[PDB]
Amino acid sequence: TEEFDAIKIALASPDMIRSWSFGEVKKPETINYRTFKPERDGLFCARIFGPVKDYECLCGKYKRLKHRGVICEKCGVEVTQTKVRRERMGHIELASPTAHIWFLKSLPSRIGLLLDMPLRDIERVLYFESYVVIEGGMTNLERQQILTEEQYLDALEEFGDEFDAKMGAEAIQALLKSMDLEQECEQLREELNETNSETKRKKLTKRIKLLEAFVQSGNKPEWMILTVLPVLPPDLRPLVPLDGGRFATSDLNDLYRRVINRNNRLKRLLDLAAPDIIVRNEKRMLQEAVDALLDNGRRGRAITGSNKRPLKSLADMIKGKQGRFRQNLL
Amino acid sequence: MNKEILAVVEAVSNEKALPREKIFEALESALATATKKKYEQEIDVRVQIDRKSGDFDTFRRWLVVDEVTQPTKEITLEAARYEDESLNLGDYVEDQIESVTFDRITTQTAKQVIVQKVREAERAMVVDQFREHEGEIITGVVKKVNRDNISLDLGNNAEAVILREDMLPRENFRPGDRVRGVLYSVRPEARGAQLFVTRSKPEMLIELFRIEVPEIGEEVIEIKAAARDPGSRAKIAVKTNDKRIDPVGACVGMRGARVQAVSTELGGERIDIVLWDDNPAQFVINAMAPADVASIVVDEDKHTMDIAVEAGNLAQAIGRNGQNVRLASQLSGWELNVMTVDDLQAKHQAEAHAAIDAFTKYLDIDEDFATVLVEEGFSTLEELAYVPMKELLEIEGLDEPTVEALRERAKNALATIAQA
Amino acid sequence: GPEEITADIPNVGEAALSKLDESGIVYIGAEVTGGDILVGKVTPKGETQLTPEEKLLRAIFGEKASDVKDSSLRVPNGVSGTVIDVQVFTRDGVEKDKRA
Amino acid sequence: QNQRIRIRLKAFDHRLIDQATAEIVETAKRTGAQVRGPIPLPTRKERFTVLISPHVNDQYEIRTHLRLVDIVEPTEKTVDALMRLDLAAGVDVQIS
Amino acid sequence: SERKFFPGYVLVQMVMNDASWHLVRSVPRVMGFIGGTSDRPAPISDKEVDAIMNRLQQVGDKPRPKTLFEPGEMVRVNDGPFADFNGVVEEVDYEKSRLKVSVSIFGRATPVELDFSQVEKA
Amino acid sequence: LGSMDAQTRRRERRAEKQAQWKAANPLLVGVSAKPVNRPILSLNRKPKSRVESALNPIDLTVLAEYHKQIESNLQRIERKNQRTWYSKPGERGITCSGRQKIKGKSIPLI
RNA sequence: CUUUAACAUUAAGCCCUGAAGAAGGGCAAAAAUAAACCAGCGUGUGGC
């Protein structure tokens, strides 16, 4: 827009994401290309994002400039310009919650600095190798104490319904909002007024400056974990028109297809009362797939057929000598 | 040349019951369009394509005429003598063989001519279905229940459509229900819906009274007028020819057992079976069968039928929104006004006061002559100048130049109102 | 529908068709410049026909040509010269054009 | 073709059901086979009351008749015409 | 179609010595075991194996295909002149093998004697 | 004897309005539907018998045969064209190459 | 038993605006969503 002052930034709430989006992608297939109409509820669509041509239903009903605004029912497509195809977001509702990769691996670890917990412990929680304890109560165990399967089994012998121990991203999500914010600040300020050792004062001033900045913002510790993941307007990652047959795919489209396939398979496995080992493995696969989507560099894994180069994730479209600061905005 | 055309013919080679030589005639008519008027001016062509060998015979001819105009197509009487009198003025028969030329535009318009021939053949098939089936009671099982219409297979691989405005507002059927309807509309040239079926038009009620009561079809009882408002209220007029049969008492039937079954078809819709009369006022008196009518003043020049109702019988006569008496209007063909005691008294006093004001203002007359014109029964100025003089010369106390001056004043008043 | 190598191109003059022969290909040795037609290629353009019977007659009788979009290989801008050699390569199955 | 075919036929009004019986005889004779019946029933009265206000301190007899149609050798056109016909509202054409 | 119940997972009986480990891992298309930890895969629980052997016990039919049928159920008829029409059955004669089905035709119940193979149970 | 309409009692609520306004004024002019736009179609229905329509319903079997003929002929022609245009070359590979390139133009933007 | 029987039609609301029984709405309740017609990115080479 025009006549705007300072740019503002903050984290993004799930309800903010539902305020953004214009439909929920469900099918991992791009286009049918028998006829070159886009498939409904795919990564491309017309009811979700917008009209394929200008001022036309996908069904091909209303073709006149004096019918603007009223949608079709043959295709559900609002008759508008194709510029709308550049600007409407989309959302995907995940089966399991999912850890953001930047806030895990910026290395000052935001989760680890927030919870006062080392990074490798949080890593082997998120990749399904351990447990944390969430309000153990009348229990020998403490809160941030982590276990293995054997200590978990022995605790289930001991305090079988007392402690509440989970694993995966839901466990970290449980630990985040279970923590208050004012009490930690006042307790650690009193402890810094009761401390003379220097390195302890360094770490504690870091932690209370983190907490004071985190409270003086608007946001919350729930929002570092994803629940609803947004997708880019499909003109902004276009499908390459080849000459003869098939269309050449981008990198983002392959990554979204992999994520949506994994999400649908996990949702069906939750629908059929699967055993626990398989849903643990599938949640680890989905966490790794979103970590492959947001930044391919921390796990240099996603390579395509006939070209064993790393695919360009969303963070690779900003950094470097070709991202949108050095390349296209200067 | 002949191989491609023969491949088209063998490709379009339908059954022997389907016309295949009309395909030859249509494609040679397309060739005659692309060859006769080509491209602007001005020649003639004949072209005939055999079916057995598939070899075109394109005789590029000219029209035999001895006319002093149009020299571009003329053949005189010498070739008629060479013909030994088998041709006359207008025909073209000679034997100059010309090769068939092609073009993008000629092949395009030949495609257009043949596909319009095929659409006319589809039109011919729908009309051949429609001659036996001009309009009938259909009883079909639904194929698809869509959100706007349902379709019916009526045997031997046919289809009929009926939308939601042709049905009752509460019809929601299931697969396997023999529903009954009336074909009413057809558009064989249109590619879309071609057989319109209804259930909520009064021709369905005509067909119900024809199927139910036999003597209506046996030329005893004459149903002339009908009107409905579906699910709620309807009226229908019957008239006997044999005086031995009561028309209302038989069309209602014993205990109303017939039309109540018709009320099964329409869902409680109260159908007033009344007697047709030639006098429209007495017909409207007969038409309000669950009501009572006191008096009706009919003025068809003003398109009014003022109906007087008795006191207390207003709600049963009017009903909901004044519709059924309006349906009685649709039963009468004339505008029947809604019946109300005090409103019609106010309307009659309005007509009387308007007549008095017009007589005292626009005629330049005295009070007694206007009193005579009010008491005669003439409330408008239209029946004072166009009326014959046999009713005006009999007025006592007025001679001939005075009544001629009064007719002149009436014509001047009508010219003043007509130019106001 | 397929594409043609015919010399029939709408919306162009007669003079640009002069260097072409009747088969749709410029002669060996015609000195052309930038912009003229080397090889005349046309594409079908419906756009909306959707008739399950008309497409049967168009694919045989209607030339495989109903409405035509120009897709002829033209000379790029600036370059000039003299056409010294033409090669024609036909798939097994299509009958060869007379210039081939 | 389920050749053992029974039909009972209800009659409130004798004229309408005689008309329908003549239509059944016509649509059975114009398809190839021959029809039998009716062999009618005598007067079977009904016990049906009316909705009338009681007196502080119509009809009683409903003449209904039955008719019988037996078919032992049908055709496909006969049962098709028995499944493609129309009737008057309020009467029964129950093929037992 | 015939859907695989778990896409891309195999349930395998073992006794879990290290020879069994290196036997399974020396099979040309096998990715590693899925357990609670590496070097010791967790065995699956007992109520889950009972629930996964129970979810393959629904393919047992005959009874009751057509020969055991209740009265008072609106079903369909596919044979005779009443082919593909709905109707309410009145009684079920198991001895005579004749269903007395009143087909709802013209908004009216028409009773007729039919067979179990001549009707469609709906 | 019901008279349980909302518009009726609302008109009875505003009876003073129609009592004051209709002093030397008409009451209502409301036109209905006319039988001119209604085809009666009642010339003859005596040969239009129900049992004759039972023996003779409507028919579009020839339409289905014609449509099946069109579909079968078009399927044969398109199967032959997609058979000899997307064939597989044998043991040696694609014996030519596409080589198609598109240059640029100077396109104004008025 | 002395020369053909039959008057039927009981169901869908309440409120506001409006010259009305011309029309415009909300709320107690719900099955069900042809055509005449303007006009790229990833490798290599080389240069500075």
Ligand SMILES: [Zn+2]
């Ligand atoms: Zn649409």
